[PDB]
Amino acid sequence: SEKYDGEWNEGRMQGWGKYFYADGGVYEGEWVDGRMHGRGTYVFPNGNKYEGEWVEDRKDGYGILLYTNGERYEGYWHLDKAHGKGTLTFLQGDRYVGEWHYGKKHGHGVLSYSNGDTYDGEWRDDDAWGYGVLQYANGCRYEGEWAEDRRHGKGLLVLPDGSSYEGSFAHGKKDGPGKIILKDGSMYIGTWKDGVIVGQGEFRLSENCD
Amino acid sequence: SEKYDGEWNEGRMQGWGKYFYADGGVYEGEWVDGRMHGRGTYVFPNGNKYEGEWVEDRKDGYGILLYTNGERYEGYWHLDKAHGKGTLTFLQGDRYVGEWHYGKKHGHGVLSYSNGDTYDGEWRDDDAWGYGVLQYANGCRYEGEWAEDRRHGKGLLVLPDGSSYEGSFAHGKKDGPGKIILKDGSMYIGTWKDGVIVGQGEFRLSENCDLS
């Protein structure tokens, strides 16, 4: 009573009710055995707002959280964190659609950046990890391996003009053995370090004129 | 005396006269001191014909020789051989216009092949020798050194698509140190043997949307 305006059952909050927390936060929604449980709205004193499902005072099931910072999560929650399928939109216009593991981008997901870049592929612990495709705004496309949100392992870099690089990347740059095919179809097989050709390599003219 | 129907001076053939040689050849033309000398026509028993200038029984000055085999020389002669400027046309349609040294293509000369190919440059002893340009029919152009009628020394090979090779040739083929530009600007510096790249070399990307 006073701090809780709602229904009771066996001396515990149960049914619909409003609760005013000491820090200025307000819940209005379903209660089970004295906890937020079922559908309910939580307006936080920091400006955040949740509308969705609750289990034992935690966000659990379907819910929408509008963040102060302009971010908006719409999808599934487990133990008070993003879990399963969910969409995160940012104020700038960036959008993530895909899999979540206790509050982190994890599994397969598509992140459409407002800058025009799109990443379609694998995530671990909020970073690009595994195989994924980045379609850059300028026409460049990387299809290959990622580690700690950077291109790392074997990958294909197709340029707008038709040029490609097939080979190794390390810490985001061409690094190790690789091959470039040029506009005219001729190919160079050689070695990169920190994104630049080092030493010498094999050059083979295309069979389309010589 | 009956072999010659023409004029005399100091008991020697001089002025205009006809002569019938034992082998069936016939000269009609100018005579000086009992020799073919000045303007005259010689029909040879092998079918060849000369019309032009003579000095002491030799083709010397301007003259046309039509050969049985279909070749035609038109130009200058010295001591009975092509010498100075002269045009040789062949049955096939091939044409040489340029310099001659005692019967050989020698100095500067243009050979227009019926193929469409043109060679403009230097000759020694009937072969391309020194600097010359071959404008091929297909658009390719070689500008560089020749030896024994084949590309040999340093040369530039520009392809129709803008690709070029700058470097060494031996016996007609890319051979030794050289460099390719691909027109997109990208360049390979390496080594050739018998017209093919051998081993490895230096590759430098051009400023296309590939180093950016």
**Residues of B at the A interface (Cβ-Cβ below 8 Å)?**
159-161, 163, 180, 182-184, 186, 188, 190, 197, 200-205, 208-210
Residue B188 near residue B179 (C-beta atoms within 8 A): yes
How wide is the angle at C-alpha B15 spanned by C-alphas B13 and B17, nearest 5°?
70
Which tokens is B205 given? 């990307």
What determination technique applies here? X-ray
Look-up of token digits 């390599």: A201
**Secondary structure, 3-state, A52-76:** EEEECCEEEEEEEEECCCCCEEEEE
CA–CA dist A186, A190 (Å, integer): 13
C-alpha radius of gyration, chain B, whole number = 26
Domains of chain A: 1-109 (2.20.110.10), 115-210 (2.20.110.10)
Which tokens is A178 given? 């690789």
**Interchain pair A209, B180: CB under 8 A:** no
CA–CA dist A41, A50 (Å, integer): 6
CA–CA dist B135, A29 (Å, integer): 89
Which tokens is A168 given? 């190794």
Of B140, B141, B104, residue with least CA distance to B125: B104
CA–CA dist B66, B41 (Å, integer): 11
By CB atoms closer than 10 A (0-12, 13-18, 19+), residue A46 is exposed
Amino acid at B152: H
Rounded to the nearest angstrom, the gap between the alpha carbon of residue B197 and the centroid of all alpha carbons in its chain is 33
CA–CA dist A59, A178 (Å, integer): 48
Considering only CB atoms, A201 lies closest to which of B160, B163, B200, namely B200
Look-up of token digits 């004193």: A45
Distances, alpha carbon A109 to alpha carbons A79, A115, A127, A139, A150, in Å: 21, 18, 11, 21, 16
Considering only CB atoms, A203 lies closest to which of B184, B188, B208, namely B188
Interacting residues of A1 by C-beta distance below 8 A, sequence separation 6+? none
Q: Where do the H-state alpha helices sit in B163-206? A: none
**Interchain pair B190, A184: CB under 8 A:** no
Q: CB count, 10 Å around CB of A192?
A: 21
Distance between A161 CA and the closest CA of chain B, angstroms: 7
CA torsion sign, B184 to B185 to B186 to B189?
positive
- The resolution in Å comes to 2.4
Residue A145 near residue A131 (C-beta atoms within 8 A): yes
Residue B138 near residue B149 (C-beta atoms within 8 A): no
CA–CA dist B128, B151 (Å, integer): 9
Amino acid at A4: Y
CA–CA dist A196, A180 (Å, integer): 12
Which tokens is B9 given? 């001076």
Question: Can you list the positions of beta strands (E) in chain A?
Answer: 4-9, 12-20, 26-32, 35-43, 49-55, 58-66, 72-78, 81-89, 95-101, 104-112, 118-124, 127-135, 141-147, 150-158, 164-170, 173-181, 187-193, 196-204
CB-facing half-sphere around the CA of B186: CA atoms within 13 A: 20
**Interchain pair A182, B210: CB under 8 A:** yes
